[PDB]
Design a protein around this ligand. Structure first.
Ligand SMILES: [Mg+2]
Ligand SMILES: [Mg+2]
Ligand SMILES: [Mg+2]
Ligand SMILES: [Mg+2]
Ligand SMILES: [Mg+2]
Ligand SMILES: [Mg+2]
Ligand SMILES: [Mg+2]
Ligand SMILES: [Mg+2]
Ligand SMILES: [Mg+2]
Ligand SMILES: [Mg+2]
Lengths: 62, 216, 225, 52, 128, 19, 124, 109
RNA sequence: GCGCUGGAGCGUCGGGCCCAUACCCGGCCGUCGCUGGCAGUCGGCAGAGCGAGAAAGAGAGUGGCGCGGACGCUACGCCGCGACGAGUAGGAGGGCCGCUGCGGUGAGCCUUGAAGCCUAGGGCGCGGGCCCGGGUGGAGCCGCCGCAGGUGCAGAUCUUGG
């Protein structure tokens, strides 16, 4: 066999939002395309924060 | 242009030449060979002229079609394969047929056909063997040969000649060619003592007879 | 018009074709030079031994700097200290092989995992066969078969390693950038030894297989490769 | 797609693609071995003739 | 002539016999339907040698030839004639299955419609 | 010569040499 | 719009039908009759459709206009084509390609028209 | 007008002490009892001939009750001339200690 | 165990051979990772690429007939590479696994025969199970999208009945 431990062999990070909001999914599709077809990591960070849940994106005050 | 010429590099092994790139450059003499720099037809109709299009658009389209396969290189058709024979099979040798209806009989071998099969024939007066094709693998070759380098087989018989047509009937040309080749083979084999009887006899395995121990 | 775009792209393709051909000539001549260096290295030791013998003295050969290590024992029942070094040697599966350079740290590590490994001094032919047949490369933490020189070049080009011959050259005659090349090389998955092991549990000195098989490791590789 | 790895020790053109100098090495060794073989045959024939 | 499919692959099945549930021959109350045992000392659960094999993931057939009939098509249940026009384009890959609840008179119309549309029917002459 | 940036002129000259 | 309606229709429309590891769409203007964003015939501003004619011969081609997006009564224009197979295929091919009217599914329309044409002929 | 196949005895399957693999069969060809003599029989066609209840088609002749299971000879097995064979279908255990024909038309001489 | 004594015993050993789910290559399934690639189907409103060892444009401007082009893309979709696959108690995820009823939906099925039941019948799915064929039945029944539960038995000296 192999001397490999599978405690952390699976990443826990998200890949899609856990909400069925169609407008959010459409924005997810747009930034998915931008992230995979642009060299700027800003879209990737926006895509990650789009995937994040409600509590992970607290309402920023004015 | 110029007359095509053979390769200037003798083959050392398969895929490797005997002369290096610079040596072959000299042999080619490239130092002094430098260089530098349909669909419509008009047809009269009695009207005017019609522009007829060959290779028209297809009348039908299937519901779906398979994608085109990838491209390979070494998968040549059987018509242009290279054919090889065992080292124990030479023109004028004696063969033992094991598979066909003439199994276990000793036959005289003539030559290798263009289809890769062995053109074999025994004296029909001896063992009832016509001019028949046979496979190299399915034939045992023995260490008894006759020198038929002075005979001439007809050149009008090939794989197409021996190809099956479609009750079977014997054509007159088959008998004529069989007699023509027998008249050259039978007198030659009769020079060797006790050879006609050996060809008439058949091959069989008795008790205690083992092919690995016995040598033919 | 497109008459200038077509000729421009033809020139660009011709330019990169010439660059590729120049690279092919480069690696060809580098391989020739490495062959000459191999001949010089092989003859030098014999010549120095001969000149010492004819004078009556002795010539101690240079102590080997490169070794090939094979994991011959399984996962089950391994001390935690032993298995940690096995992980550091990248020997996880049984019959996994790797090249390790020799030093004070390496020799002690081989000693502490002596019962579970078989290590020796491979020669040029062994390195050639292992790299060409069982030699893969870790490309983007994957396992890609080394079927082309561009795979090695894209990852080891900055270390003046552009072709497999350069890789073999550094592996045999350890250079400055040996660690990067060895870490690039995936651990070798060698088959079971044809003909069988004489004895797995015991040391090679006492007739077994484990331990320091100095120059006899080539015999093991010839049948495990 | 996945490329089927062919053994350079078995295949010739695969070995040449990885290392072009193998072609010249394999040409030289064949010519050297053939030349050495015919030299030994000639030497053995000369020795047999002298002994005879 | 029977309506041949677009492609006829060589369907290879890793296992043909069904997975018989443990001790289904011994008792009548136990049905042949498989159930994974949770016994502490269960002989089959610890997959002892020469025991009942368990339905592992590795028995999954190839995706290219999955759910494929021996004729080379895929079953599709059809109730009325209106559903046949759905499979009009999927002619060379998918066949049509007539529901058990379809009456004889409607089944005749479905069969003749599929004959016009060159759609294979598994049971074209079920009731007649 | 094989270096892309610094071998461009050398590759250009050998290309002209072939012509 | 189009994607906005698709995100609702993709798994909720009455035309949707799932069984036997397969899913389709029985909307009146769906080429290939399968549920996809490319071939949906209700969520696109411009749509083509190939259907058999009222008589047992010919093919009716349905096109969606530009103005009456919210007027379903006048949104579609139906043209009947009754001629040879080659001419019908050329007519549909020109109708889509040279008008640039949803050129993504011109081949699918041609396949459907050919399938309808071969189905209309008497069966041996 | 006689036998054209070597005689072989179906000794058993390719088996361990406690396990057997039915896809490979062990054959004992009469006459050969060593590895240096089993080289000739490699690659030959081995056929097991048996009869049945009802008739079956026979190529080049009238249908009859004889059936066979064709197979090839893969490689040697042990120092005593025993050989390994693989058949299109695994040989039934009824054939243990029964004659199997080893043909000669897969010739290599 | 049978048996074994120029061993089939004892000590030192040499070849050869035998086979595990172990190792090497290959096929298939699934998981994980590259949080990899695909909106570029940009077509007489056109020009077919971004696999290539080397950070960045097949970038633009100022002067010296024939009317043609396969699939794709349910983006919750498709496709490409690698590594891995044991499991009690226990945890999590996917169920186009199963039952009952409710809201929608199938111009759904049905006395030209529904549920139920039997079947040496044809199959599919790894599996939960499911779809057709044949016989009895005479009046109801199901698929998809969501909702709800008194929702799955081999045991409990389980309850009732046989
Ligand atoms: Mg494993
Ligand atoms: Mg975890
Ligand atoms: Mg142990
Ligand atoms: Mg062996
Ligand atoms: Mg226990
Ligand atoms: Mg597991
Ligand atoms: Mg209830
Ligand atoms: Mg029963
Ligand atoms: Mg009533
Ligand atoms: Mg019970």
């Amino acid at each position: 066999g192999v001397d490999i431990r599978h405690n952390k062999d699976r990443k826990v990070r998200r890949k899609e939002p856990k909400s069925q909001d169609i407008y959010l999914r459409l924005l997810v599709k747009l930034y998915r395309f931008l992230a995979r077809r642009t060299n700027s990591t800003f879209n990737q960070v926006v895509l990650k924060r789009l995937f994040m849940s409600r509590t992970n994106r607290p309402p920023l005050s004015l | 242009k110029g007359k095509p010429h053979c390769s200037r590099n003798p083959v050392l092994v398969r895929g490797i030449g005997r002369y290096s790139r610079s040596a072959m450059y000299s042999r080619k003499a490239l130092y002094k060979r430098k260089y530098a720099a349909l669909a419509t037809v008009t047809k009269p109709v009695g009207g005017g002229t019609r522009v007829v299009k060959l290779r028209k658009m297809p009348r039908y389209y299937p519901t779906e079609d398979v994608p085109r396969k990838l491209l390979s290189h070494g998968k040549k058709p059987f018509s242009q394969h290279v054919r090889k024979l065992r080292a124990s099979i030479t023109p004028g040798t004696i063969l033992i047929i094991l598979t066909g209806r003439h199994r276990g009989k000793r036959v005289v071998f003539l030559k290798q056909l263009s289809s890769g099969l062995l053109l074999v024939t025994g004296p029909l007066s001896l063992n009832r063997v016509p001019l028949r094709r046979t496979h190299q693998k399915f034939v045992i070759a023995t260490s008894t040969k006759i020198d038929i380098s002075g005979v001439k087989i007809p050149k009008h018989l090939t794989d197409a000649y021996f190809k099956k047509k479609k009750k079977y009937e014997i054509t007159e040309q088959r008998k004529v060619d069989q007699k023509a080749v027998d008249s050259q083979i039978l007198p030659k084999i009769k020079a060797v003592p006790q050879l006609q009887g050996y060809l008439r006899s058949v091959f069989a395995l008795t008790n205690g007879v083992y092919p690995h121990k016995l040598v033919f | 018009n497109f008459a200038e775009l077509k000729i421009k792209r033809l020139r660009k393709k011709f330019a990169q074709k010439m660059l590729r051909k120049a690279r092919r000539k480069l690696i060809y001549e580098k391989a020739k030079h490495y062959h000459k260096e191999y001949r010089q290295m092989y003859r030098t030791e014999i010549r120095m031994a001969r000149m010492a013998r004819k004078a009556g003295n002795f010539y101690v050969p240079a102590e080997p700097k490169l070794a090939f290590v094979i994991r011959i024992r399984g996962i089950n029942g391994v001390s935690p200290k032993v298995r940690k070094v096995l992980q550091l040697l990248r020997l996880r599966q049984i019959f996994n092989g790797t090249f390790v350079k020799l030093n004070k740290a390496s020799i002690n590590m081989l000693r502490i995992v002596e019962p579970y490994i078989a290590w020796g001094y491979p020669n040029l032919k062994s390195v050639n066969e292992l790299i060409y047949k069982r030699g893969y490369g870790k490309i983007n933490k994957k396992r890609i078969a080394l079927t082309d020189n561009t795979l090695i070049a894209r990852s080891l080009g900055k270390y003046n390693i552009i072709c497999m011959e350069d890789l073999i050259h550094e592996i045999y005659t350890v250079g400055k950038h040996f660690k990067e090349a060895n870490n690039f090389l995936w651990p070798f998955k060698l088959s079971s030894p044809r003909g069988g092991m004489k004895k797995k549990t015991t040391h090679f000195v006492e007739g077994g297989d484990a331990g320091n098989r100095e120059d006899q490791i080539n015999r093991l590789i010839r049948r495990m490769n | 797609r996945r490329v089927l790895k062919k053994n350079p020790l078995k295949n010739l053109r695969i070995m040449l693609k990885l290392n072009p100098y193998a072609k010249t090495m394999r040409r030289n060794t064949i010519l050297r071995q053939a030349r050495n073989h015919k030299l030994r045959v000639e030497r053995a024939a000369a020795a047999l003739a002298a002994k005879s | 002539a029977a309506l041949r499919p677009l492609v006829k692959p060589k369907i290879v099945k890793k296992r043909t016999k069904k997975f018989i549930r443990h001790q289904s021959d011994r008792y009548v109350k136990i049905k042949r339907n498989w159930r994974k045992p949770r016994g502490i000392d269960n002989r089959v659960r610890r997959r002892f040698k020469g025991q009942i094999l368990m339905p592992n993931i590795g028995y999954g057939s190839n995706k290219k030839t999955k759910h494929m009939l021996p004729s080379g098509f895929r079953k599709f249940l059809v109730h009325n004639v209106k559903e046949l026009e759905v499979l009009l384009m999927c002619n060379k890959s998918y066949c049509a299955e007539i529901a058990h609840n379809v009456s004889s008179k409607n089944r005749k119309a479905i069969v003749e419609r599929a004959a016009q549309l060159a759609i294979r029917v598994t049971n074209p002459n079920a009731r007649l | 010569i094989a270096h892309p940036k610094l071998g461009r002129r050398a590759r250009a000259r050998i290309a002209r040499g072939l012509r | 719009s189009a994607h906005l309606q698709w995100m609702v229709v993709r798994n909720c429309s009455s035309f949707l039908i799932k069984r036997n590891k397969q899913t389709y769409s029985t909307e009146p203007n769906n080429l290939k009759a399968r549920n996809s964003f490319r071939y949906n015939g209700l969520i696109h501003r411009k749509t083509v459709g190939v259907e058999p004619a009222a008589d047992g011969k010919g093919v009716v081609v349905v096109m969606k206009r530009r103005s009456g997006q919210r007027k379903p009564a006048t949104s579609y224009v139906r043209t009947t084509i009754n001629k040879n197979a080659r001419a019908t295929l050329s007519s549909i091919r020109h109708m889509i390609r040279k008008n640039k009217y949803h050129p993504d599914l011109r081949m699918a329309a041609i396949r459907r028209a050919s399938a309808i044409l071969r189905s209309q002929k008497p069966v041996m | 007008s006689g036998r054209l196949w070597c005689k072989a005895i179906f000794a058993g399957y390719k088996r361990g002490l406690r396990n057997q693999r039915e896809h490979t069969a062990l054959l004992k060809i009469e006459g050969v009892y060593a590895r240096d003599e089993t080289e000739f029989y490699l690659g030959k066609r081995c056929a097991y001939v048996y009869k049945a209840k009802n008739n079956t088609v026979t190529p080049g002749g009238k249908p009859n009750k004889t059936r066979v299971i064709w197979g090839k000879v893969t490689r040697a097995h042990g120092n005593s001339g025993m050989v390994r064979a693989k058949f299109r279908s695994n040989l039934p255990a009824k054939a243990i200690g029964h004659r199997i024909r080893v043909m000669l038309y897969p010739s290599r001489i």
